[PDB]
Design a binder for this molecule. Structure first.
Ligand SMILES: Nc1nc2c(ncn2[C@@H]2O[C@H](COP(=O)(O)OP(=O)(O)OP(=O)(O)O)[C@@H](O)[C@H]2O)c(=O)[nH]1
Ligand SMILES: Nc1nc2c(ncn2[C@@H]2O[C@H](COP(=O)(O)OP(=O)(O)O)[C@@H](O)[C@H]2O)c(=O)[nH]1
Ligand SMILES: [Mg+2]
Ligand SMILES: [Zn+2]
Lengths: 435, 429, 332
C-alpha cells in the first residue's frame, strides 16, 4: 500500500529496467509471465495484481526508437509487462537534446503522462517516482527534462528519484555529451528531488579488479545497478529491523535545495572463487564501501568531504556491529565530514539477504550494504564538464543542429551561467565556518 | 482501579510496546489469545489496571498504537502476541512522517491526531478511575517526536490533572542513527518540558554497553534492548499492579522525584544483570543489588553520574526481602558517596518494595535517578543543534511545512535556559 | 555595513536622480539603529585631508579624469567566470583553498565584504565594476589581510572582547584597514590610493554639507552619478534626514591607517603584525611575549619581505607621501 512507479526513458533506462525487473521477478518468486507457484504485502508496492495469479509491473517504458522496446517485446519478458505501457516513438532524438525536448518528444509526452496518470490513480499510497535515464543520449536528457517538468507541475509534492548515468571523464561514446548534460542538468536542477550519480567507467574498473572479469558486457553493469536499486527499495519491499522510506532519503541526503547529487556505492562485490578466504565482516564491508576504489563514480572522495551518507544493510546484520563500524569510520581522519554536520549517517537494516541471479557473476552472500553518499568531490566533476562545454562552445561547434531544432543560443549561455552558479555553491559550502 | 492507558508512537515506540506487552502478559499469565491461563489470583486482582476484561472472559490490553506507515504496524499484527490487541486500535496513516518533525507535528499528524484523541477518549470513559498516561516513543524519528508531542499537548489540554509518563529514547552521543536528529530532539524537548510530568531518558549506547560488557552478549539484537526497557517499565508499574510491604504509585514517584516543575528527566537502571554463566558464582543479596545500581556502567543513560549530583533517587525493589536490610544499604550508600548527592535535600532516597519477583529470579530492583549529570546530554545536543542551525542546513524541509526560524530560536533558547537551571541547582549552596 | 545600508536606498536614489540631484534623501534603517557605533563615528577628522587631496590631484594630473584612470589602470570589466577563476587561483596561492564561501552580488556599497554567515567565513564580491588588475588587490585586502589576521587572531589569548581587555589591546583599526588598503595596491604599476583618499575627503565634507551639496561637491573629482551616489551614502550612513550636515566617519580609517603604517614601516615587523591577529602596530612589542605563533599564517605576498618593503616605498612615491612629509605629519 506504498506504491512507487518506475519510468524508464531512453535505451539506457530500458536496458537497466530489463535487469531490474528480472531481479525483482527473481526476488519475489515471480515467473516471467507474472505467475508465482519472511515474506508478507511485499510485492504489492511494485507489482499490481489482476484477478488471476498474474501480476504486472508498474513500469512505463518510453522510447523514441522502437528497436530496444521491440527487443523487450520479443524477449523472455514478453508476457510480463502491460502492453499499453511500452510506448514507442518513431524517430529517436539521435543524441540531440532539442529533438528530445522540443520537437519529437513533444508529440508523445501527452500519451506518456496519460499512462502515468492511469497508473497513479490505480494506486492508493503512491510514494514517488523512479526515473531510469542516461545523461548523454538525446532522448534521455531531453525527454527526461520534459517529463520531470510535467510531473512536477502535475504531482505537486511527491518523491522524484533519478538514476542518471554521469558522463565519464575519459570514455565517451557520444560526441555531444557536454551539451546534453548541461541542458538536462539546468532543467532537472529545479525539479528532481534526489538524483543518483553512476558512471560506466567506474563500473568497468570494479568489474575488472574485484569481480575478476576482464571483458564485461552492458549486461554486467546493468546487473550491478539493478542490485543497487533493489537494495534501495528493500526497505519498502521487505520487513526490516530499521526501515526507511524514500522521503527519508530526500530529507537526510539533501541539505540544500540544489545540492542533491549523491553518488552510489555497493558492497560486497566478490567473485564466486574468492567467496571463501574471507568471512565478510560487516565492519569489513563498511570499510569496503568507504574505500575510494569501490565507489561507482570516477571521483576520489579524498578530494572532497562527505556532507551526508546513508548506508542500507541487508541480511544477517546486528545493529551493534554497525554502530561500532560507523564509530570507527568516524574516528579516521581521511574521511572528513563538514564541520557543520556532526551527524553524517542514516542507517537502515533489512532482514532479507540479497539474492543472486542465476547466470550472474557475483556470489551468494549473507550480508550486503548499499551506500548513497552526498559529497563535495562531485563538484570537481562538474568543472570538467563545464570545461568541455566551454571549448565546444568557444567555436560554436554543433550549435546549428540545436538552433535549427527549436532552441536559442541565449539558452546555452543561461545554462552555462546556471552550472557556474552550482559550482560556486559547491565551493561555498565546502568551506568552513567562523566563530 | 487506577487504570493506565498505553500510547505507542513511532516505530521504536511500537516495537518497545510489543515487547512490553509480551512481558506484562508473561507476568499476569495471559495466553497469546488474550485469555487468562494463570495460576495466582493476585494476577487478576489488579488485572484491570492495564487490561480490560472483554466479554466471554477475555482480556485486551489498553493500548493505542499510532504510526504514519503501516509497515511496522502490520509486522506487529502478524507476529505472535499481536492477535490480542483490539484491532480497532491500530491507527495508521499513509504518507509517513519521512523522518521529519514538521510532518509529524503540523502537516501529517494534524490528520490522525483527531482519531487518536477519539480512541483515547473512548478508553478514558471506559476506565473507572484513570491513573495516568504512559507514552512510549523516540526522539529522533519524525513520527515519534512530532506526533507524540502533539498528542501530549492535546491530552494535557483535555486532562490537566492526570499524570504523564514518557519513555523517550534519547539520541546516543557517539553514533547518530539519523542526520537531522538534533532538530527533532530540540523541538520534542521543548514540547516535553512544556507539558510533561516525567521523562525517562534512554540511550541506545548505554544499552549496547550493558548487553556487551555486563551480560556478555556479542550479538545484541533489538529484541534484547527492548526486553531490557520493558523490564524497566514493568518494574516501575509493579508497585501498584501488585501488593507490597511498602507500595508505590506513579503519583508517588512524580511527587518524590520532581522538586521543580521543569527538572523532571530521569535516568533508569535495572539490577541484577548476570550473564548466563556468571550467575551461580554470585550471591543475590540486597547489598549486591544496591551496589550494582550505583555506577556509570549500569546507567541506561550515557552520562557518568559522577560529573554531577543526584538531585533525587527512587528505588523500587521486588521479591521477598527484609526492609531493615534495604534501609541499611541505602544508609551506607548515601554515606560513602556524600559528594555525589545534593546538600540541601536530606534523605534523598525514595524506597518502594513489592512482593513478587519479575519471574525466574529471587529479587530484582529498579533505579530511577533524577541527577544533574544529564545536563551534559542537553549541552551536547544543544551544541549540535547550534552548529546545524548556524549554516541553516536542512532548514528548508522544516520551513516548507509552515514552521519558521523563530520556532528554532525560541526552542534553543528554552533548552539553554533549562541547562542553566540544571547548572544553577547543581552548584547551589 | 548591512545595518547602516538604508532600507529605502533605491526609492530615495530614484527620487534623487529624477529631481536632477536637488532632492535630499530621507533614509530609513532596520530598527534599532546601532546608536553606540553612530556616536563613535559622528565626527570627521581633517588630520590627513591634504594628503587625501594630494592623492586625488596626483591621479587627475596624470590621468586627467578618474574615468580614464579606472579604465587605464584597472583593466577590463570582468565576467562572473573570470572572477571565479581569479579567486580560485588566489585561494590556492594563499593556501586557504576550500575555507571561504564566495558569493557574487550587485548590491554592495564596496568592491567586496568579508563576512561571517552561518558562523562561517563568506566573501561577497560586487560583480558591478569588478576589473582585471584591481580584483587581485581586493583579494589581497579581504583574504590576504582581513581573513588571515582573523584566523591568526582566533588562536590568540585576545581572540574575544575579554581577551582584548585582559591583554590591554588598542583597537584593531586603523591598523587593520590601513594594512588591507596598502595590500590592495601592492603589486600595481600605478598604486594610487584613490578609494582611500576620496572616502576620507567625502566624509570631511559630509560633516559640513547636505547630501545635495556633497553630491555636487564631488563632481570636481568624479563625474559618474552612480559612483558619486555610492560615496555620498557611505559618508552619510545612519543619517536619516540628509538635508542636515553630518557623517559616518568610519571610512576615514583607510587613509588614517595607510599614513600611520607607512610613517612607522621601518620599525614594524609585518609578518609578526599579521601573525598576532587583529592588533594595532603599536601593540606588537607589548603582545609579542604572549602571542602563540606556531601555526599562524602570513600572506604569500609577504614571503619575499625585501620586495614587500620596496612596494611600500613605491606606494609612497606614487601617492606623494615621501619620508620627510610623513616625518612632519607625525613627529613620533
Ligand atoms: N549502464 C549502462 N549504460 C548504458 C547501457 N546502454 C547504453 N548506456 C548508456 O547510454 C548512453 C548512450 O545514450 P542513450 O541514453 O542510450 O541514448 P538513447 O537512450 O538511445 O536515446 P537517444 O539519445 O535518442 O538515442 C551511453 O553513454 C551509455 O552510457 C547499459 O546497458 N548500461
Ligand atoms: N531502543 C530501541 N530504539 C529503537 C528501535 N528501533 C528504532 N529505535 C530508535 O528510533 C529512532 C527512529 O525513529 P522511528 O520511529 O523509527 O522513525 P519515525 O517513523 O519517524 O518515528 C532511532 O533513533 C532509533 O534509535 C528499537 O527496537 N529499540
Ligand atoms: Mg536513443
Ligand atoms: Zn576592508
Amino acid at each position: 500500500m506504498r506504491e512507487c512507479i518506475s519510468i524508464h526513458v531512453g535505451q539506457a533506462g530500458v536496458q537497466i529496467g530489463n535487469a531490474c525487473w528480472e531481479l525483482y521477478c527473481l526476488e519475489h518468486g515471480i515467473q516471467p509471465d507474472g505467475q508465482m507457484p519472511h515474506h508478507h504485502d511485499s510485492f504489492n508496492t511494485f507489482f499490481s495484481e489482476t484477478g488471476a495469479g498474474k501480476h504486472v509491473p508498474r513500469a512505463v517504458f518510453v522510447d523514441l526508437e522502437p528497436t530496444v522496446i521491440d527487443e523487450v517485446r520479443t524477449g523472455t519478458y514478453r508476457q510480463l509487462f502491460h502492453p499499453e505501457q511500452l510506448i514507442t516513438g518513431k524517430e529517436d532524438a539521435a543524441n540531440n537534446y532539442a529533438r528530445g525536448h522540443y520537437t519529437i518528444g513533444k508529440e508523445i509526452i501527452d500519451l506518456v503522462l496519460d499512462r502515468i496518470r492511469k497508473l497513479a490513480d490505480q494506486c492508493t499510497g503512491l510514494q514517488g517516482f523512479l526515473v531510469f535515464h542516461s545523461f548523454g543520449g538525446g532522448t534521455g536528457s531531453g525527454f527526461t527534462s520534459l517529463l520531470m517538468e510535467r510531473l512536477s507541475v502535475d504531482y505537486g509534492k511527491k518523491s522524484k528519484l533519478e538514476f542518471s548515468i554521469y558522463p565519464a571523464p575519459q570514455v565517451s561514446t557520444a560526441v555531444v555529451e557536454p551539451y546534453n548534460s548541461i541542458l538536462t542538468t539546468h532543467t532537472t536542477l529545479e525539479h528532481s528531488d534526489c538524483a543518483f550519480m553512476v558512471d560506466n567507467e567506474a563500473i568497468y574498473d570494479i568489474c575488472r579488479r574485484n569481480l575478476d572479469i576482464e571483458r564485461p558486457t552492458y549486461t554486467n553493469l546493468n546487473r550491478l545497478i539493478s542490485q543497487i536499486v533493489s537494495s534501495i527499495t528493500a526497505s519498502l519491499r521487505f520487513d526490516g529491523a530499521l526501515n526507511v522510506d524514500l522521503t527519508e532519503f530526500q530529507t537526510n541526503l539533501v541539505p540544500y535545495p540544489r545540492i542533491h547529487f549523491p553518488l552510489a556505492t555497493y558492497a560486497p562485490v566478490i567473485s564466486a572463487e574468492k567467496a571463501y578466504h574471507e568471512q565478510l565482516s560487516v565492519a569489513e564491508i563498511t570499510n569496503a564501501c568507504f574505500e575510494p576504489a569501490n565507489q561507482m563514480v570516477k571521483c576520489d572522495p579524498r578530494h572532497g568531504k562527505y556532507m551526508a551518507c546513508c548506508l542500507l544493510y541487508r541480511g544477517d546484520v546486528v545493529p551493534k556491529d554497525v554502530n561500532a563500524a560507523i564509530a570507527t569510520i568516524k574516528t579516521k581522519r581521511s574521511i572528513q565530514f563538514v564541520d557543520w554536520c556532526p551527524t553524517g549517517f542514516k542507517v537502515g537494516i533489512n532482514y532479507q539477504p540479497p539474492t543472486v541471479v542465476p547466470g550472474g557473476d557475483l556470489a551468494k552472500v549473507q550480508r550486503a550494504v548499499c551506500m548513497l553518499s552526498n559529497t563535495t568531490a562531485i563538484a570537481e566533476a562538474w568543472a570538467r564538464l563545464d570545461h568541455k562545454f566551454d571549448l565546444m562552445y568557444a567555436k560554436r561547434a554543433f550549435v546549428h543542429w540545436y538552433v535549427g531544432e527549436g532552441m536559442e543560443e541565449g539558452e546555452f549561455s543561461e545554462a552555462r551561467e546556471d552550472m557556474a552558479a552550482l559550482e560556486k555553491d559547491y565551493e561555498e559550502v565546502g568551506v568552513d565556518s567562523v566563530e | 482501579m487506577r487504570e493506565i492507558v498505553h500510547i505507542q508512537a513511532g516505530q521504536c515506540g511500537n516495537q518497545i510496546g510489543a515487547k512490553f506487552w509480551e512481558v506484562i502478559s508473561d507476568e499476569h499469565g495471559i495466553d497469546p489469545s488474550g485469555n487468562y491461563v494463570g495460576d495466582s489470583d493476585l494476577q487478576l486482582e489488579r488485572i484491570s489496571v492495564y487490561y480490560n476484561e472483554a466479554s466471554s472472559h477475555k482480556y485486551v490490553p489498553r493500548a493505542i498504537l499510532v504510526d504514519l506507515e503501516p509497515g511496522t504496524m502490520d509486522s506487529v499484527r502478524s507476529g505472535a502476541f499481536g492477535h490480542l490487541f483490539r484491532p480497532d486500535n491500530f491507527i495508521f496513516g499513509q504518507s509517513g512522517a519521512g523522518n521529519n518533525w514538521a510532518k509529524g507535528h503540523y502537516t501529517e499528524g494534524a490528520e490522525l491526531v483527531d482519531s487518536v484523541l477519539d480512541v483515547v477518549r473512548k478508553e478514558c470513559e471506559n476506565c473507572d478511575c484513570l491513573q495516568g498516561f504512559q507514552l512510549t516513543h523516540s526522539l529522533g524519528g519524525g513520527t515519534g517526536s512530532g506526533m507524540g508531542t502533539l498528542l501530549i499537548s492535546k491530552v494535557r489540554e483535555e486532562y490537566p490533572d492526570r499524570i504523564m509518563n514518557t519513555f523517550s529514547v534519547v539520541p546516543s552521543p557517539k553514533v547518530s542513527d539519523t542526520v537531522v536528529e538534533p532538530y527533532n530532539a530540540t523541538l520534542s524537548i521543548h514540547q516535553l518540558v512544556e507539558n510533561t510530568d516525567e521523562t525517562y531518558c534512554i540511550d541506545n549506547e548505554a544499552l549496547y554497553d550493558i548487553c556487551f560488557r555486563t551480560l556478555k552478549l556479542a550479538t545484541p539484537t533489538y529484541g534484547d534492548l527492548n526486553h531490557l526497557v520493558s523490564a524497566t517499565m514493568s518494574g516501575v508499574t509493579t508497585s501498584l499492579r501488585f501488593p507490597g510491604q511498602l507500595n508505590a504509585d506513579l503519583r508517588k514517584l512524580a511527587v518524590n522525584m520532581v522538586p521543580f516543575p521543569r527538572l523532571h528527566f530521569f535516568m533508569p537502571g535495572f539490577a541484577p544483570l548476570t550473564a548466563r554463566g556468571s550467575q551461580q558464582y554470585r550471591a543475590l543479596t540486597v547489598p549486591e543489588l544496591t551496589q550494582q545500581m550505583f555506577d556509570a556502567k549500569n546507567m541506561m543513560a550515557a552520562c557518568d553520574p559522577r560529573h554531577g549530583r543526584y538531585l533525587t533517587v527512587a528505588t523500587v525493589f521486588r521479591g521477598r526481602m527484609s526492609m531493615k536490610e534495604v534501609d541499611e544499604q541505602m544508609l551506607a550508600i548515601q554515606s560513602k558517596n556524600s559528594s555525589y548527592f545534593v546538600e540541601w535535600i536530606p534523605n534523598n532516597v525514595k524506597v518502594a518494595v513489592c512482593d513478587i519477583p519479575p519471574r525466574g529470579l529471587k529479587m530484582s530492583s529498579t533505579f530511577i535517578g533524577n541527577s544533574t549529570a544529564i545536563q551534559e546530554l542537553f549541552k551536547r545536543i544543544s551544541e549540535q543543534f547550534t552548529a546545524m542551525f548556524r549554516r541553516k542546513a536542512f532548514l528548508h524541509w522544516y520551513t516548507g511545512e509552515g514552521m519558521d526560524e523563530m520556532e528554532f530560536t525560541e526552542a534553543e533558547s528554552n533548552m539553554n535556559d533549562l541547562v542553566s537551571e540544571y547548572q544553577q541547582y547543581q552548584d547551589a549552596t | 555595513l548591512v545595518a547602516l545600508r538604508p532600507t529605502n536606498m533605491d526609492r530615495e536614489r530614484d527620487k534623487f536622480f529624477q529631481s536632477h540631484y536637488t532632492y535630499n534623501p530621507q533614509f530609513e534603517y532596520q530598527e534599532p539603529m546601532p546608536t553606540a557605533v553612530l556616536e563613535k563615528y559622528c565626527e570627521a577628522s581633517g588630520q590627513f585631508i591634504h594628503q587625501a587631496v594630494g592623492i586625488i590631484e596626483a591621479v587627475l594630473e596624470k590621468f586627467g579624469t578618474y574615468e580614464h584612470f579606472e579604465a587605464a589602470t584597472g583593466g577590463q570589466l570582468l565576467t562572473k567566470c573570470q572572477i571565479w577563476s581569479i579567486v580560485r587561483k588566489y585561494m590556492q596561492k594563499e593556501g586557504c583553498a576550500g575555507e571561504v564561501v564566495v558569493q557574487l552580488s550587485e548590491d554592495l556599497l564596496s568592491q567586496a565584504v568579508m563576512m561571517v554567515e552561518n558562523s562561517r567565513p563568506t566573501l561577497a564580491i560586487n560583480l558591478t565594476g569588478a576589473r582585471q588588475y584591481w580584483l587581485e588587490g581586493m583579494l589581497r585586502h579581504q583574504i590576504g589581510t582581513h581573513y588571515l589576521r582573523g584566523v591568526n587572531n582566533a588562536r590568540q589569548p585576545w581572540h574575544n572582547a575579554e581577551g582584548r581587555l585582559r591583554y590591554g589591546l588598542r583597537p584593531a583599526n586603523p591598523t587593520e584597514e590601513g594594512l588591507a588598503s596598502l595590500h590592495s595596491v601592492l603589486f600595481r604599476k600605478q598604486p594610487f590610493l584613490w578609494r582611500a583618499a576620496l572616502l576620507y575627503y567625502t566624509i570631511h565634507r559630509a560633516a559640513r554639507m547636505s547630501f545635495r551639496q556633497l553630491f555636487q561637491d564631488l563632481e570636481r573629482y568624479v563625474q559618474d552619478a552612480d559612483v558619486r551616489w555610492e560615496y555620498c551614502v557611505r559618508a552619510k550612513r545612519g543619517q536619516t534626514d540628509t538635508s542636515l550636515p553630518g557623517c559616518f566617519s568610519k571610512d576615514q580609517v583607510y587613509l588614517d591607517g595607510i599614513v600611520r603604517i607607512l610613517r612607522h614601516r621601518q620599525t614594524i615587523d609585518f609578518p609578526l603584525l599579521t601573525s598576532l591577529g587583529k592588533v594595532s602596530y603599536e601593540d606588537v612589542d607589548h603582545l609579542r611575549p604572549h602571542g602563540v605563533l606556531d601555526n599562524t599564517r602570513v600572506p604569500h605576498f609577504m614571503q619575499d619581505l625585501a620586495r614587500y618593503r620596496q612596494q611600500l616605498e613605491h606606494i609612497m612615491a606614487t601617492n606623494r607621501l615621501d619620508e620627510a612629509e610623513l616625518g612632519r605629519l607625525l613627529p613620533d
